[PDB]
Design a protein around this ligand. Structure first.
Ligand SMILES: N[C@@H](CCC(=O)N[C@@H](CS[C@@H]1c2ccccc2-c2ccccc2[C@H]1O)C(=O)NCC(=O)O)C(=O)O
Ligand SMILES: N[C@@H](CCC(=O)N[C@@H](CS[C@@H]1c2ccccc2-c2ccccc2[C@H]1O)C(=O)NCC(=O)O)C(=O)O
Lengths: 217, 217
């Protein structure tokens, strides 16, 4: 089978785990565990980081036959090309490219805040920027069923994950944007997705490592 | 013409400027200035941020008629598809995808240090990590003339840029890596590039905004 390697946290790997399920991929995962404070040992990974034949050793990684990939985005794209989940027109391609990169931006923002020792000080302020962020996604999506247009593409798995994370962070953030709540429901309603969510493999939380100030357990 | 907007710094926009030049594109630039400390005024940009019809307003931006794009990597991809500078086979696509994202990781590491108020004390630690980073690029490229294979692709524009930035930061960092010095020369050796470098338009440094601790003026 294919092998997915990552920490035993949702982190930035949710989209790949969902896409493996949606495509009915034959895969097994290696979920590395980090140690407890003060040490937070990374040994389980570190011992084999440079023994896997990866070009640029990192987590997550994907092993698919003789192909070895790192970089979450490159893993998504690889799987999208494999299963025909890319945009079919220039218009869809552009939408997907922008979405993929914007998600990473909004992700880094949450991460950077969640790892700040001053998290509690900062929250209030970060919370005030949510509406403006969500608004942008809502207006982009509009009346379309999916982010790139008429069909589900790999970017919907990226956007699902980030909107879901923001929603966990702030329960009421999507209340003013019905199309986004609708989108979450539509994504969760995809048959393989609905099944996966009830399974033992589903890892919703924690999102972050032991080290973060939020969703660390 | 196409309009490229960004700060009046190199930042993360070098690859686009190089690419517009390499493909002989007709384009004008809007180089926004930032005020000096302590306020670091951003009004030139902010005065029009929400007035350009961008889906997710940001810098850089590229306006190509009706087409309005943000996210640096989506701009590279759009220009790459227009001019057939994408990988042609699966193998080249995967190499491109990984390098694109890896470059961003190595760019973000540099930014994190350069914006750290503990810059001078932090620097030593940073320097120790460079040899490893360069080694991975060196081993990945190997004996290939270009990053994706035997033809220049958009990713060579990204790789050029991050390799050059690190080389400016630590001038002895490529000495141990023959094929990386060769690559820089090959790339700078391209007619259109060589020509641009002599042009009024060329903007090598500052790399960072006025707020940084290095290459800030
Ligand atoms: N840009 C690369 C991310 C590479 C990276 O930072 N990987 C981290 C895990 S993601 C990491 C993370 C860790 C734990 C919990 C959460 C996260 C996470 C979540 C969201 C966004 C980013 C992260 C990273 O901090 C790592 O541990 N790499 C192996 C190594 O360096 O030796 C990619 O998109 O795949
Ligand atoms: N993910 C986006 C980058 C988004 C971004 O942070 N844009 C910055 C400039 S790059 C920014 C930067 C600025 C000056 C100098 C250097 C940099 C830089 C260099 C490398 C990597 C990242 C940066 C950013 O901090 C900006 O000012 N956005 C407009 C806004 O917020 O209203 C992309 O790839 O285009």
């Amino acid at each position: 089978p294919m092998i997915l390697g990552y920490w035993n946290v949702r982190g930035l790997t949710h989209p790949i785990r969902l896409l493996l399920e949606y495509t009915d991929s034959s895969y097994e995962e290696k979920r590395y565990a980090m140690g407890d404070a003060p040490d937070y040992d990374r040994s389980q990974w570190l011992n084999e980081k440079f023994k896997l034949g990866l070009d640029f050793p990192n987590l997550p990684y994907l092993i698919d036959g003789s192909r070895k990939i790192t970089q979450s985005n490159a893993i998504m794209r690889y799987l999208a090309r494999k299963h025909h989940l890319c945009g079919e027109t220039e218009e869809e391609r552009i939408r997907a490219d922008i979405v993929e990169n914007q998600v990473m931006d909004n992700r880094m923002q949450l991460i950077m805040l969640c790892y700040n020792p001053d998290f509690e000080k900062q929250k209030p302020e970060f919370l005030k920027t949510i509406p403006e962020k969500m608004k942008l996604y809502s207006e982009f999506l509009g009346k379309r069923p999916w982010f790139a247009g008429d069909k589900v593409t790999y970017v919907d798995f990226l956007a699902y994950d980030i909107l879901d994370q923001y929603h966990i962070f702030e329960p009421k953030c999507l209340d003013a944007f019905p199309n986004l709540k609708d989108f979450l429901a539509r994504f969760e309603g995809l048959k393989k997705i609905s099944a996966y969510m009830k399974s033992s493999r589903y890892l919703s939380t924690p999102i972050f490592s032991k080290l973060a100030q939020w969703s660390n357990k």
